[PDB]
Amino acid sequence: VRLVHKQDLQRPVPDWLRHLVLDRIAWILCVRGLLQELSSIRHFLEKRDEMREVARDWLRVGYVLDRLLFRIYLLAVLAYSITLVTLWSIW
Amino acid sequence: VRGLLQELSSIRHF
Amino acid sequence: LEKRDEMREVARDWLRVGYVLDRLLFRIYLLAVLAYSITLVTLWSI
């Protein structure tokens, strides 16, 4: 939940983008001055849109990691349980 | 000729 | 548009300040807990 969020900061690092969104994803899957105004409006629009896209990528990373860790936790619980019942059986 | 259309197209796009 | 964008930037700066302070105070609190704990165990041993 710290990974995926809208904090208006940063960008997903490529080094850990390949490690998660690429490798771990496959591993888990298996004359008038009117123009100067429009330019500024467009500027504000893409200014927001950019941060939205960054937040989208971080959302991707966070989701992949969350799913993988979910698999790990589930398997851990099942293993702990099977050890529990084998101990129940031996007594 | 004015380049206002290339701006409006982008705004509409977003 | 810029009326909102400006306030957004201001909120961003306050977010920066708040985050820095929060991290620093996190360091302080953590070290305080560790020190209190080491005093606890040094008392436990004696």
A34 vs B: CB within 8 A? yes
How far, in Å, CA of A48 to CA of A87, rounded? 57
Give which of B4, A43, A36 is closest to C1, Cα–Cα. A43
Angle (CA) A86 A87 A90, round 5°: 85
Chain A to chain B Cβ contacts (< 8 Å)? 21
A31 min Cα distance to partner chain B (Å): 9
Cβ atoms of residues A64 and A23 within 8 Å: no
Give which of B6, A46, A50, A34 is closest to C1, Cα–Cα. A46
| AA identity, residue A60 | R
How far, in Å, CA of B1 to CA of A16, rounded? 46
Instruction: Count the Cβ atoms, other than its own, within 10 Å of residue B7.
Output: 19
| AA identity, residue A16 | W
Instruction: Count the Cβ atoms, other than its own, within 10 Å of residue A35.
Output: 14
Note the resolution in Å, 1 decimal. Answer: 3.5
C22 vs A: CB within 8 A? no
A46 contacts in chain B (CB < 8 Å): 10, 14
Cβ atoms of residues B7 and A45 within 8 Å: no
CB contact under 8 A, A38 and B7: yes
A41 vs B: CB within 8 A? yes
User: DSSP assignment, residue A34?
Assistant: T
B12 vs A: CB within 8 A? no
- Chain-centre distance for alpha carbon A81: 30
User: Chains that contact C by 3+ CB pairs under 8 Å?
Assistant: A
User: Which method resolved this structure?
Assistant: X-ray
Cβ atoms of residues A46 and A90 within 8 Å: no
Q: A55 to each of A11, A23, A27, A50, how far by Cα in Å? A: 8, 20, 23, 9
How far, in Å, CA of A41 to CA of C4, rounded? 12
Alpha helices in A1-34 (DSSP H): 14-17, 25-29
